[PDB]
């Protein structure tokens, strides 16, 4: 047959040449299976070979994809042009420094996530002794908070993060929470120092956009909140003794 075309607006930036973001427009063929990631590949194949963007897996599990689409944080490989016939506008993932085109400086993300210690601490059990015993009951305590693919859409959601780039973030808070609530760990006190910081849970105002854009339904807003409970118990504890 004959494929339709969509005027896609993508936000370009080359730090060796521009003084700031420089917009563009590309005619992209499409049908009912074409993603934004399919479009970015096409543009780079036939329209602008110098166009850069992160990607890999193509099936919404890797998390490199992240970028704004009509000012919504979303994964390109799960965004489809069929829904943007009246306009589209890809911008590099919000609240992050832009390094080039659709790629952003994820440094603060990785340092945050590194700063809460996301790994089993204090369990002397050794592989010979067989596995730990943990029910689906103990597992349902944290299982939803474990599906995070470190994509970053919620940092672009969160207006607090935009106002306070020292805020450790929804993801990072959810992850430290995911280990607090695992019956196999014994290192909650090694994490509270970060979570009790002003840049901890207490920089979160329950705006709730984070969980709304999560492509894996982790509900970070639920983890943090539960962390303010906990942070508080710890406040209580410490203060009262």
């Amino acid at each position: 047959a004959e494929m339709k075309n969509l005027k896609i607006e993508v936000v370009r930036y080359n730090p060796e040449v521009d003084t700031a973001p420089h917009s563009a427009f590309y005619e992209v063929p499409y049908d009912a299976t074409t993603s934004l990631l399919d479009a970015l590949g096409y543009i780079k194949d036939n329209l602008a070979p110098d166009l850069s963007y992160r990607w890999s897996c193509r099936m919404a599990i890797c998390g490199s994809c992240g970028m704004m689409v009509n000012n919504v944080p979303k994964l390109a490989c799960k965004t489809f042009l069929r829904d943007y016939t009246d306009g589209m506008k890809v911008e590099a993932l919000a609240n992050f420094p832009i390094e080039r085109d659709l790629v952003v400086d994820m440094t603060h993300f990785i340092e945050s996530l590194e700063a809460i210690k996301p790994y089993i601490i204090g369990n002397s059990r050794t592989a010979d002794q067989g596995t730990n015993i943990q029910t689906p009951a103990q597992m349902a305590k944290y299982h939803q908070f474990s599906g995070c693919i470190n994509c970053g859409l919620c940092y672009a959601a969160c207006p607090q993060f935009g106002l306070n780039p020292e805020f450790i973030g929804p993801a990072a808070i959810t992850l430290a929470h995911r280990y607090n609530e695992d019956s196999r760990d014994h290192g909650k006190k090694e994490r509270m120092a970060q979570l009790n910081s002003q840049n901890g849970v207490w920089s979160c105002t329950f705006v709730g956009y984070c969980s709304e854009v999560c492509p894996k339904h982790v509900d970070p807003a639920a983890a943090i909140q539960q962390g303010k409970v906990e942070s508080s118990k710890d406040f209580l504890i410490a203060t009262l003794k």
Binding site: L163, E166, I168, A193, Q194, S197, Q198, N199, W202, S232
Partner: protein, 119 residues
């Protein structure tokens, strides 16, 4: 980049009151604005339910002084919390903003505590 030994904050105190305050004004406020803000001045009540002698007969009882202090003070510590943070959100720099808002809350808290031990 990111600190190693950050200062444990103090927000779990305010957040505690703002929590308590937010939950009181969610269950009780709706009926309180109905009664006091609408029925009372519209006389939409049977007989002398909301008449000066009855309201003073209630306010002066023990259960009334406790409820009138909670009705006033807990939503204060919840609203003024939210304002404090609305400020940051709106990028509005208020000097000693922690003192202004929370000091207003304690000011009014004392002022209402004075009131429920009666003038």
């Amino acid at each position: 980049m990111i600190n190693p030994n950050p200062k444990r904050s103090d927000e779990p105190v305010f957040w505690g009151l703002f929590g308590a305050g937010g939950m009181w004004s969610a269950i009780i406020a709706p009926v309180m604005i109905l009664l006091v803000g609408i029925l009372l001045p519209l006389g939409l009540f049977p007989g002398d339910a909301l008449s000066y002698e009855r309201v003073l007969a209630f306010a002066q009882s023990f259960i009334g002084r406790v409820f009138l202090f909670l009705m006033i003070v807990l939503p204060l510590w919840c609203g003024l919390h939210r304002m404090h943070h609305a400020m940051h959100d709106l990028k509005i720099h208020v000097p000693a903003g922690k003192w202004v808002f929370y000091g207003l809350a304690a000011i009014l808290t004392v002022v209402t505590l004075i009131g429920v031990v009666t003038i």
